[PDB]
Amino acid sequence: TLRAAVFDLDGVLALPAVFGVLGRTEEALALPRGLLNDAFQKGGPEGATTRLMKGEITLSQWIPLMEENCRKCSETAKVCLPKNFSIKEIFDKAISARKINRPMLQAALMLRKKGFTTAILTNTWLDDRAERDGLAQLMCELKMHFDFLIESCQVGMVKPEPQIYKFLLDTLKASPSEVVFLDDIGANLKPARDLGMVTILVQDTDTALKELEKVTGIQLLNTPAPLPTSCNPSDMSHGYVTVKPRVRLHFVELGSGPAVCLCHGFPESWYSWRYQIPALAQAGYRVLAMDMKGYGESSAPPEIEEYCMEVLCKEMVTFLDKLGLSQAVFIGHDWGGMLVWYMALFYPERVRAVASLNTPFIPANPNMSPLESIKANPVFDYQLYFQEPGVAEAELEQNLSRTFKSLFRASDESVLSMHKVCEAGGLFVNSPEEPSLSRMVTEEEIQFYVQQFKKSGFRGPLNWYRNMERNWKWACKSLGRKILIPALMVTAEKDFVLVPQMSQHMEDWIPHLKRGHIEDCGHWTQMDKPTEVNQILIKWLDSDARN
Template structure:
C-alpha cells in the first residue's frame, strides 16, 4: 500500500493506493482516516481493482480548502474530480462510509457515467432520515450534530487527547467480540489534531446541517442528495446503528435500481469495515463481481 498525492477540484489530496485495474474509490467519514479501508483494499487489489482511499478535504494530510468549504456539493465534486484525475473510466466503482457515504450517494447520482457500481455503508439516502426524527434514542445518537454547531466545540473536542472522539467511537460501535478501535481512533485524531483541520471536520456539520434550514425545504444538502444512483447499489448497515432497521433497509433496497442489494450486519455498529471486515469484504466482492 503506497501513499501518494494528486490535485483534484483545486485540492491537494493525499491518498493510499493498492493494486492495478479499474478505479475503486473509497471515501471515509468522520472521525476516520483512509486507513479504515486497510482490510478491504488488499481484497479489491487481488480482485483486479486499483483501490484508492483519499483523505477527504480538510483532513490531514490532505489540503484544507482555501475557502474553508466542507459543503456536500464540494465533497461530491471532489469525488468526481478524483475519478477524472486518477484516470477512472466507466468501469470505476465508488465505495463510501459516513460522510464518504453521503459523498458517494451524490457522486454516483450526479455523474452516473463515471461509476459502474456503488457501495454505501451506514448513511441511508437522506429521504429516509425522517423515519426516526422524533425517536429520543436517535436524537441522542445524533447529539453531535447539534453540539458541533457550537463554537465552544473547537475547544472542548481536543481536550484530553480528543476524549470526545473516543466517546463517539464507543458510542457508535456494536457488540462484535474482540473489536479494537485503538489504531483507527488514533488515525482519525491525527487527521484532525491541528486546530485548522479540526475546524474542517466540524465544518462538515456546520456547513451541511444548518440550524435554520436543516429538515426544511430550504435544506441545501437534502436538495443536493435528493436523487438516487441509477447504477446497481449495495447498501450495508450495522444492526446496532439505529438509523436503519430491517423494515427501513427493505424500503431502501426497494427504491434502488435493478441489481441492487442490501444487508443488515448483525451485532455491528457504525464501523462495519472495521468491526466485521471479513463479512463486509465478502459481500462487496460478491456484489462487484456479480
C-alpha cells in the same frame, strides 16, 4: 529456543505441489511410473532442470529441454508418447492449479505475529510463460507475509546444496539451533538437519503443523478465525491530487483492476479501510482509499461552504478527472456513504457502481427543512451540537486519544450517548477520562488517528455537518431522479444512529438495489466486522461492478 520459521513453497505454502503433477500425468497417460520424473531430473546437477532452478535459463528455454528428456527417458523403457503430449500443457495446468495452502500461511502468519522471523526458501524458476502472471500474483500475495523470500533462481543456489542453507542462515542472522525448516522433500531436509536445525518433513499440512506447533510451543492448528490483512501506513502507496487551488486530496492506492474509491466517514481516515484495502486489492481491484476533504493528509480549508455536498462531490469528480479515470466504483461509509449516494445521483457517468455502509439513501423532504427533521429524532441530537463553530472542535480536540478511544467502540462497549448532548453540554460530559481499550482497536491504531487529526483538527470534519440547508437545496434538484446504476446498501444491526430501519424504503429510488446486513456490528463497520464486509463487498463487486 526457536526464533525462525522457513517454509518451502511448492508443497508447503502452495499446493498441489507442481512437479507433483508429473506423477499424475503418468498414471493418467498410463506411462511407465516415474518416467516424467526421471526426465524432470535428467542429468542431476548438470541437468537442464538444475540450470533452470539456478536462473541460468528461463522456464521457456527449459520446456523444450524437458521435452527432449521425455523422448530419451521413454526411448529406454521401450515406450513412446501420445500424439498430443505437451510439457507446457502439463505445467501451465500444474502452476495455475497450485494455490496457497491457507492453513500453512496461517501458521506462518501466527508465528510471525509472535516474534518469529519467517522466510520462504524455494527452488523456483524465472517464469517467462505467457501465463507467468499467474505465478506472479500468487507470489505477490505471499511475499508481503514473510520477512524474507529466498528464491533459488535469484541466488543461483538451489537446495540440497548446503550453500543455499548457509545463505539462508546468513539472511536470517540466526544460528541453526533456532530455525525450523518445513519441506515436503526429505533430501532438502538433510542439509538443514546437518547444520543443526529443526526440520519437519511435510506430507499433510495438519501433521506438519502439529509437529511445528510442538517444536515451537505455539498454537497454530485449530486457531481462531484470524483478522484480514491490515496494512502498514508506511508501506502503502500515497497519492496526492490537487483538485483545486490549495485543495489537494490524499489517498492510499493498492492493487490493479476496476478503480474502487473508498470514502471514510466522520471522524475517520483512509485508515478506516485498513482491512478491506488489501482484500479488495487481492480480489482484483485498484483500491483508492481516500482522505476525505478535511482529514489527514488532505486539505482542510477552514470555511464551512467548502464542505457542502455539492462542492465535495465536484472535487471528487475532478479527482477522477485528474487521475485520468472516467469511472470508479464509489464505496462510502457514514458521511462518505452519503457522499457516494449523491455521486450516483449527480454523476452517474462517473460511478461504475455505488455502495454504502450504514448510511441509507433518503431523498430530501421538499417541505420540511433539515434542521427541523433532525430535531425530530432524539438520537440525532449531537448534530445540533456540532452546528456552532468551535464548540464541538474544542471538546473533540481537548484529548484526541480520549476522543477516539471514546468513539471507536463495538455495540457492547458504548461509553457515550448520542442522545442528549445539547443538554449534557458536551459529548463526553459523563464519559471516563481514560476510556478503556476497545476490542476493535489497538493502542497503536488509535494513535494513528490521533496523529492524523493533529494536523487539521475537527474543523474541516465538523463542517460536513454544517451545510444541511445547502445540501438540502442541492438534493431537492435530484428528487425526480433514480439511482439505476449498480447500487449496494449494507446495513449494520447494532448501529444505533444509522439504524437498518432507515433504509427500508430505499428500493423506491433504487429499484435494483442489492443489500447486505451484518449482525452484532456497530457503527464502525469496517473495524467491527472486516471479514464480513470484505466478503459482502467483494461478492458485490465481482457481480455488479466488474462485468
